[PDB]
Design a protein around this ligand. Structure first.
Ligand SMILES: Cc1cnc(Nc2ccc(N3CCN(C)CC3)cc2)nc1Nc1cccc(S(=O)(=O)NC(C)(C)C)c1
Length: 127
């Protein structure tokens, strides 16, 4: 089967704003996770075709990845910081759903999620 289209990253009909929290999510949170040694499998939508995973998009109906999250932030797609946080959580939980406890890719996600939670603990108060 084909890959689904990637999640929307721009919508000219969605209102836009800049907040210090969204700036932090891009400049601090995303940036720190992106450079992590275990980040690479989470940097783009899963290409189930190239990876030969016929069941991936049978199981994962709400795909999400850091490339999509980054594009959303660069485009001012998010209105609330919580939208972005929800997207990271969806990414992590999709990993845990598709795979099994103890799998290498799960350990990788766990490492990234721990770091994510550390950075979110330092989220500045909404100005
Ligand atoms: C975000 C994400 C969540 N789950 C899985 N699981 C996964 C993917 C591929 C495989 N295989 C199956 C065996 N086959 C020969 C190649 C890849 C196994 C599990 N992969 C993810 N991303 C991913 C992105 C790019 C490449 C790969 S990967 O290099 O094909 N797979 C591992 C070795 C990292 C697990 C994986």
């Amino acid at each position: 089967s084909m890959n689904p289209p990637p999640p929307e990253t721009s919508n000219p009909n969605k209102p836009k704003r800049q907040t210090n929290q969204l700036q932090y999510l891009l400049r601090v949170v995303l940036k720190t996770l992106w450079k992590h040694q275990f980040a690479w499998p989470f940097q783009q939508p899963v290409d189930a075709v190239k990876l030969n995973l016929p069941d991936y998009y049978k199981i994962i109906k709400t795909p999400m990845d850091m490339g999509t999250i980054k594009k959303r932030l660069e485009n001012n797609y998010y209105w609330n910081a919580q939208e972005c946080i929800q997207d990271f959580n969806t990414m992590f939980t999709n990993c845990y759903i598709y795979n099994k406890p103890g799998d290498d890719i799960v350990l990788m996600a766990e490492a990234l999620e721990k770091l994510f939670l550390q950075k979110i603990n330092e989220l500045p108060t909404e100005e």
